[PDB]
Amino acid sequence: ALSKVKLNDTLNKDQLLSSSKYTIQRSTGDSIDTPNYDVQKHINKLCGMLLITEDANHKFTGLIGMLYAMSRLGREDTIKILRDAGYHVKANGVDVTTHRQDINGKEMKFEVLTLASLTTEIQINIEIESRKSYKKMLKEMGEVAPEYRHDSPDCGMIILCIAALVITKLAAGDRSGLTAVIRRANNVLKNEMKRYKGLLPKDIANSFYEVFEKHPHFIDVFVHFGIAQSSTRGGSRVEGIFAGLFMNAYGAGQVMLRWGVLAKSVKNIMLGHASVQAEMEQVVEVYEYAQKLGGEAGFYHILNNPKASLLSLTQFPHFSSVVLGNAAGLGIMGEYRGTPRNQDLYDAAKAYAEQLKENGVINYSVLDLTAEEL
Amino acid sequence: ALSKVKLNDTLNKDQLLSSSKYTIQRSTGDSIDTPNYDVQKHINKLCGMLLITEDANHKFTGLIGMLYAMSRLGREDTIKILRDAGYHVKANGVDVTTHRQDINGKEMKFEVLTLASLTTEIQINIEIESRKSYKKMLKEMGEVAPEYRHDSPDCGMIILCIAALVITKLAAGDRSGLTAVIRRANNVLKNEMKRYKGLLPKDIANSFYEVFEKHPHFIDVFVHFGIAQSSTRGGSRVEGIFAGLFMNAYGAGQVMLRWGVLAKSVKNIMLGHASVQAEMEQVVEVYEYAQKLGGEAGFYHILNNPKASLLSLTQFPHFSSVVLGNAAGLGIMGEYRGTPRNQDLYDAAKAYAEQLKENGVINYSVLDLTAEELEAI
RNA sequence: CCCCCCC
RNA sequence: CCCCCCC
RNA sequence: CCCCCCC
Ligand SMILES: O[B-](O)(O)O
Ligand SMILES: O[B-](O)(O)O
């Protein structure tokens, strides 16, 4: 039978990768700081110091943010996530030590962390500049409220909130999302920006973009932290904001998959086209593959998962075009940098979708109506 | 087939979070007082002291209320709830000690608790001001009845009754509910307010609002206490009031879910609309998800559970609008701060719902009627 | 190669 | 982001 | 909040 002449390449390719007899292990570099729960409070204070600092130097915030996420996971778990990801790790133990240095003649004491990635000389400067901003703040308002200070438990998570926004736009893979990252960091997180002078979306977002670009293993660390954080029973409102923003990243780099379901849901006529119907057998394969993977597939593009390519609908020019057309006709795309391979099908689908948002007839068969006198 | 082109994002997102291989542990701060059952009676007396005090300082009532809830749970269980929630806890043992201090020259004895959160100096002042209010009360009525005194077992739970009302309106997350909290604390809990001069709904409600804002882990403690309390076989009438008020919180921050079932139940015509029908596949996913979670989902918004966002119907502009319309047409909303994304669908649904409350024909097929002679009646 | 919107 | 009523 | 009769 001609029905038997088929080959499920999408499923078979996944099968090949899922059933590997051998494994690779990547060298991360020299050393990774793995802070445990004991150091967590200190990192939160360090995060707060950057947040209180007016016109702060967010060169290290991306890395500091990562340290806080790791301190929440705790040494044991963070090492486990690094090893499970496929990395050879030389773990550096983070401990609190008192450093004595004479700044402006007067000998001063500082509580610093034993970090390889962060110098003790740069750590003291974060505290130095924060104290300047704190005394200026104390001079302006007399007494500083718990909301405006570096001590606040929200501090670490506030920084990680923009990290969740960076992760949201990593699918583009070129820092193009930065504008949207800043925009959203202003709409959401508005109250947080009021309390902290150092909450500079652009500055912090670039720092995280840099850390994820320079250290791709940290993106795996963050994604797994975010999931672990989102597994919690409850928490603060800032922790709720983070969880929401982190979940906005789920399904990034696979918008066509969701827009495809939309086109079906709105019943765009162009889906029934002969050239679109030819692709159907194979488009179902990818949808069934996406269904099979479940939650796992959500962060496939964020973390550069090799199997992310398998979820592409771009390989089907006709279906992608009607899907993209429907999205344009419903006015839901833009400035989406996706181009339709078949222009005629796109234009036809865009036209029908534009006509759909003008009509709308009531389907009385859906409702459980008895004696109708309507 | 085009029927196969689907993706259950709601279910998959939950699956991802439910199957986490790794865990986070949060630092609560420095120390949390974990009082055991032995200290429970003392806290109830302290609660009673604030309740007998005319124009009492309810600055610490939110925290004292939490201590009573923890003393009912008992050290072991409270530590367990804190650890299960995802918090690193340095437990402080609460013990009763006698403190001698000379107030107005005369050396006085006081029974105080070894609390980190509450100073022994502030504890004595609660007792000092209560004694003043007690002697004034003794001068007014001669003999003080068991209902009017601080000794009463209801005291601790009376304070926790307004804590249940605060928890009821935490979904708004901005203290906006305070007006309703006070209002309800007057309708319900009316007899309790008669017996206690210090039962100031506004003052106590703000204290609990503050404690839940400053210490988010305490909201987890309270919710779990409330469930544990509501698991009881029986109790006092005040304990019954609490249980009822605590259960009013179940499903807060998810009113649209319940109003959606209402729209279906009343058979609002606008549900059959083309743009509403397109969303249907996905709206069922969330309803089935809510059905799957069961009782767990009830306090998802109260405790800032990460998965609470997944229960939102706001992501479906058309369905939400008809649901909100039906709620307005039936006159059940207001002043609900929810805005319909599709105005035309809302107005159409509001109109139909208004027409529904005017009609009403009897459906005789529902009843198990045999030989019908009602048409003659 | 894949990706690219909004929230 | 989510939420927001009444009881 | 719930409840509220009779036997
Ligand atoms: O543990 B180290 O090497 O002191 O940082
Ligand atoms: O147990 B403590 O430390 O005495 O309160």
Curated annotation (Swiss-Prot), chain B:
Keywords (A to Z) from UniProt: Capsid protein, Helical capsid protein, Host cytoplasm, Host-virus interaction, Inhibition of host innate immune response by virus, Inhibition of host interferon signaling pathway by virus, Inhibition of host MAVS by virus, Inhibition of host MDA5 by virus, Inhibition of host NF-kappa-B by virus, Inhibition of host PKR by virus, Inhibition of host RLR pathway by virus, Interferon antiviral system evasion, Phosphoprotein, Ribonucleoprotein, RNA-binding, Viral immunoevasion, Viral nucleoprotein, Virion
GO biological process, alphabetically ordered: symbiont-mediated suppression of host cytoplasmic pattern recognition receptor signaling pathway via inhibition of MAVS activity; symbiont-mediated suppression of host cytoplasmic pattern recognition receptor signaling pathway via inhibition of MDA-5 activity; symbiont-mediated suppression of host NF-kappaB cascade; symbiont-mediated suppression of host PKR/eIFalpha signaling; symbiont-mediated suppression of host type I interferon-mediated signaling pathway
One Gene Ontology molecular-function label: protein serine/threonine kinase inhibitor activity
InterPro entries associated with the record: Pneumo_ncap (IPR004930)
Phosphotyrosine, modified sites: 37
One cellular component term from this protein's GO annotations in UniProt: helical viral capsid
Effect of residue 131 to A: Almost complete loss of viral RNA synthesis
Region (Interaction with the phosphoprotein): 30-251, 243-289, 337-363
Protein origin, superkingdom: Viruses
Similarity remark: Belongs to the paramyxoviruses nucleocapsid family.
Oligomer and partners: Homomultimerizes to form the nucleocapsid. Binds to viral genomic RNA. Interacts (via N-terminus) with the phosphoprotein P (via C-terminus); the phosphorylated phosphoprotein P binds to N-RNA complex. When in a monomeric RNA-free form, interacts with the phosphoprotein (via N-terminus). Interacts with protein M2-1; this interaction allows the association of nucleocapsid with the matrix protein. Interacts with host EIF2AK2/PKR; this interaction inhibits EIF2AK2 phosphorylation of EIF2S1 and blocks EIF2AK2-mediated translation shutoff.
Task performed by this protein: Encapsidates the viral RNA genome by forming a left-handed helical nucleocapsid that protects the RNA from nucleases. RNA replication depends on the availability of soluble nucleoprotein. The encapsidated genomic RNA is termed the NC and serves as template for transcription and replication. Together with the phosphoprotein, sequesters host NF-kappa-B in inclusion bodies (IBs) thereby inhibiting this host defense pathway. May also act as a modulator of the innate immune response by sequestration of host IFIH1/MDA5 and MAVS into IBs.
Name listed for the protein in its UniProt record: Nucleoprotein
Biological source species: Human respiratory syncytial virus A (strain A2)
